[PDB]
Write a protein that binds this ligand. Structure first.
Ligand SMILES: NCc1ccc(NC(=O)N(CCCCO)Cc2ccc(C(=O)NO)cc2)cc1
Ligand SMILES: [Cl-]
Ligand SMILES: [K+]
Ligand SMILES: [K+]
Ligand SMILES: [Zn+2]
Length: 357
């Protein structure tokens, strides 16, 4: 098989003991995996085994203090789990959360290894809890360790320190943790599309705005594409890819592409409120496959409509397997505010990318 797939039902054991209906559900990953079986995608893929991340691998991006505190939760009494989660913005913790965060990260390291050793061309990782809100020193927004950031540092640790890694973050939320981890880094190009609403959308920081371009040698290697005032869908995401993501990505010439693949911008997602279709995600996937000689690892982030995330991620795997990509309407006019967002990002990044000049 050209396409790898990682999935381990052990990542279901992370659970919310005070709200069993919290939308970051165990069954997010089992529903996506079941859909792969139903569509006969699983048997077309090379199965890659999950493993635990080591504490040494977590230290690629996270402080010893942060690793120690989350690790300390694995044997905590429920009262202590509840108090610990309450130290963070939007975290719940069970005795299994630490192990599950380790399995998500190690599953993606096994997937990046399979790509870079040439065992597979591309790969999908059906993992939880998600990662992109996780900072060097703290948990945030259902995320303990930053799986995608760790995977980029893991890839560099088995090739070269300056291996060009593109991270495309199409989850409807800003990956604040990913941006912060790589803010001063020109080896990892971070591109995020996210609902912003002038800071009313989680995680509610001006850090997500189009003028955050990177710091020092990192100037130009942080691309925020913020959506305001507007139910955004395939036309706006396609336009963002045409005008910003693909020109910048081709100029950067990545050696590995990681997708922070939240499916919470999907039609029917109750937290994202957007209308990206399964064919939209297939189109974005096929665009990214034109990069890095096709070396693309798709990492699950958010996505809360169980049916929508199952169908949407299955259509990404379908594209990685070389199935015929969709032909979508590039002439549909955009929401007026999306044109404004794209022009704001172009203005901010034209100093850094000759492809935008
Ligand atoms: N029980 C139903 C329920 C619970 C929570 C939410 N939404 C939130 O908890 N979040 C948004 C508001 C935070 C406090 O103002 C947190 C959140 C939402 C989405 C994501 C994500 O997928 N990002 O990648 C992360 C954190 C809705 C319904
Ligand atoms: Cl199958
Ligand atoms: K994003
Ligand atoms: K960067
Ligand atoms: Zn999200």
């Amino acid at each position: 098989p050209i396409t790898g797939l990682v999935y381990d039902q052990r990542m279901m054991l992370h659970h919310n003991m005070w709200d069993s209906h919290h939308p970051e559900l165990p069954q997010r990953i089992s529903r996506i995996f079941s859909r792969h079986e139903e569509l006969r995608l699983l048997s077309r893929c090379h199965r890659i085994p999950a493993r635990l991340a080591t504490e040494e691998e977590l230290a690629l991006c996270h402080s010893s203090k942060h690793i120690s505190i989350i690790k300390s939760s694995e044997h905590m009494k429920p009262r202590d789990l509840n108090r610990l989660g309450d130290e963070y913005n939007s975290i719940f913790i069970s005795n299994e959360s630490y192990t599950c965060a380790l399995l998500a990260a190690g599953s993606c390291f096994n997937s990046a290894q399979a790509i870079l050793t040439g065992q597979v061309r591309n790969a999908v990782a059906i993992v939880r809890p998600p990662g992109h809100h996780a900072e060097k020193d703290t948990a945030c927004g259902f995320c303990f360790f930053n799986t995608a950031a760790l995977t980029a540092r893991y890839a560099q640790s088995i090739t070269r320190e300056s291996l060009r890694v593109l991270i495309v973050d199409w989850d409807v939320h800003h990956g604040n943790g990913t941006q912060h981890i790589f803010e001063e880094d020109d080896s990892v190009l971070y591109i995020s599309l996210h609902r912003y609403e002038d800071g009313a959308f989680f995680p509610n920081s001006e850090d997500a705005n189009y003028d955050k371009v990177g710091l020092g040698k990192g100037r130009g290697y942080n691309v925020n594409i913020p959506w305001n005032g507007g139910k955004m869908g395939d036309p706006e995401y396609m336009a963002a890819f045409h005008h910003l993501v693909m020109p910048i990505a081709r100029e950067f010439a990545p050696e590995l592409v990681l997708v922070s693949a939240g499916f919470d911008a999907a039609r029917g997602d109750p937290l994202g409120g957007f209308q990206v279709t399964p064919e939209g995600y297939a189109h974005l996937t096929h665009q990214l496959m034109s990069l890095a000689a096709g070396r693309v690892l798709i990492i699950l982030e958010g996505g809360y409509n169980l049916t929508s995330i199952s169908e949407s991620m299955s259509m990404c795997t379908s594209m990685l397997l070389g199935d015929s990509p969709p032909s979508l309407d590039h002439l549909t006019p955009l929401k007026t505010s999306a044109t404004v967002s794209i022009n704001n990002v172009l203005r901010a990044h034209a100093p850094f990318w000759s492809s935008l000049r």
